[PDB]
Amino acid sequence: SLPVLQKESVFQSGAHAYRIPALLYLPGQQSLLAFAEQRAAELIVLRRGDYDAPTHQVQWQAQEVVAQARLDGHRSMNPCPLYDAQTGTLFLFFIAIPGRANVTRLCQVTSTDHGRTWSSPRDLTDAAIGPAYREWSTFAVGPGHCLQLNDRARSLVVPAYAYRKLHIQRPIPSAFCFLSHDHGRTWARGHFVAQDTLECQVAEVEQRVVTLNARSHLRARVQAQSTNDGLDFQESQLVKKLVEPPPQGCQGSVISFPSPRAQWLLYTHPTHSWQRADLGAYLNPRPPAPEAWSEPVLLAKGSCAYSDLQSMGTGPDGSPLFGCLYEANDYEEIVFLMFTLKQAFPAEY
Numbered sequence: 001s002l003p004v005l006q007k008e009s010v011f012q013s014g015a016h017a018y019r020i021p022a023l024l025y026l027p028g029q030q031s032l033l034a035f036a037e038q039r040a041a042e043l044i045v046l047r048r049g050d051y052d053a054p055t056h057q058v059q060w061q062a063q064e065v066v067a068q069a070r071l072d073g074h075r076s077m078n079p080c081p082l083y084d085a086q087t088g089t090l091f092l093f094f095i096a097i098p099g100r101a102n103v104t105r106l107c108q109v110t111s112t113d114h115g116r117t118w119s120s121p122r123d124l125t126d127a128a129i130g131p132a133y134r135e136w137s138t139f140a141v142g143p144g145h146c147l148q149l150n151d152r153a154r155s156l157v158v159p160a161y162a163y164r165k166l167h168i169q170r171p172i173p174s175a176f177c178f179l180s181h182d183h184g185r186t187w188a189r190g191h192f193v194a195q196d197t198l199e200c201q202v203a204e205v206e207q208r209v210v211t212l213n214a215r216s217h218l219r220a221r222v223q224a225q226s227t228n229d230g231l232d233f234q235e236s237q238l239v240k241k242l243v244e245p246p247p248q249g250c251q252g253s254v255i256s257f258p259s260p261r262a263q264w265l266l267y268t269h270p271t272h273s274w275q276r277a278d279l280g281a282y283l284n285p286r287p288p289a290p291e292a293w294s295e296p297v298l299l300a301k302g303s304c305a306y307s308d309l310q311s312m313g314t315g316p317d318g319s320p321l322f323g324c325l326y327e328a329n330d331y332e333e334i335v336f337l338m339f340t341l342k343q344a345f346p347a348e349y
């Protein structure tokens, strides 16, 4: 299908299994960081990748284990990378569940050497959630990259969802954002969006809004936008243009990038309505506008699942360079795709 700069496998089954990928680009470093769950949900691993423009290809180093990203007697999962341009610090957020009552933990480990080494995990659970904790059974972050805003305080936005016990029934899940306006010092919990929303990610648009796209039991993605930097999500509706597979849907990813014409959205997710196959790439020139969403362009044929996008700057063709990470061939491996806006949306460049 679609010709791309590079298509390679960064993780593969054998010794252990790997799922739930997360991608992070380090602008002033030309580098990328591929995160994932190393399953015997056990530990989180990481692979550093140095991108070279001339050879149109990224060079991946050895695989490593974020030793710090874990709590004793707790499995880890849902790695959510995020980079603070302001301080140049790195944040890897995750979840720790022990080996009806909530026992989930929110944790973060930071790096100041571009992810070469990490700190001690900070358990943000009690200060970040508060009394509402007991009101849930479980929650989670990402999985995937998080967001930093363009507001005064260059706030940090972490996408998440909680499994609300609102009743005589199961628990209902709703997405929300963990906000910090002091570079991961303090954390607050923004409000929820429509019910029955799950794994999600956010991106900033053009005055300034936060578009949040979430997984859903239904047959179409659920999309909500915010005007108060993620605190609230006024609008919120089904985007029939973005199919969602049968079971309980599947995780997608979305990022923003500068329009060649103020940003546009790129989104990745399986295109098959009846399964997790044929990973497409949808483009939105008039974000957030739900009907502005284009048809998808086939990125990879066959079985596909969780994915994560990353804007990588300028491609060798002059167009926006993108970095994709997705689960393939029935979780047998994880692939790193790299292409440009040109190759994907030739009519749009």
Ligand SMILES: CCC(CC)[C@H](NC(C)=O)[C@@H]1[C@H](O)[C@@H](C(=O)O)C[C@H]1NC(=N)N
Binding pocket: 020, 041, 077, 078, 140, 198, 199, 215, 249, 250, 251
């Ligand atoms: C129970 C809530 C689910 C998310 C909608 C569930 N996530 C967690 C943290 O348990 C995911 C889901 O069951 C699996 C999938 O859809 O592929 C992956 C699975 N995620 C992980 N094993 N990390």
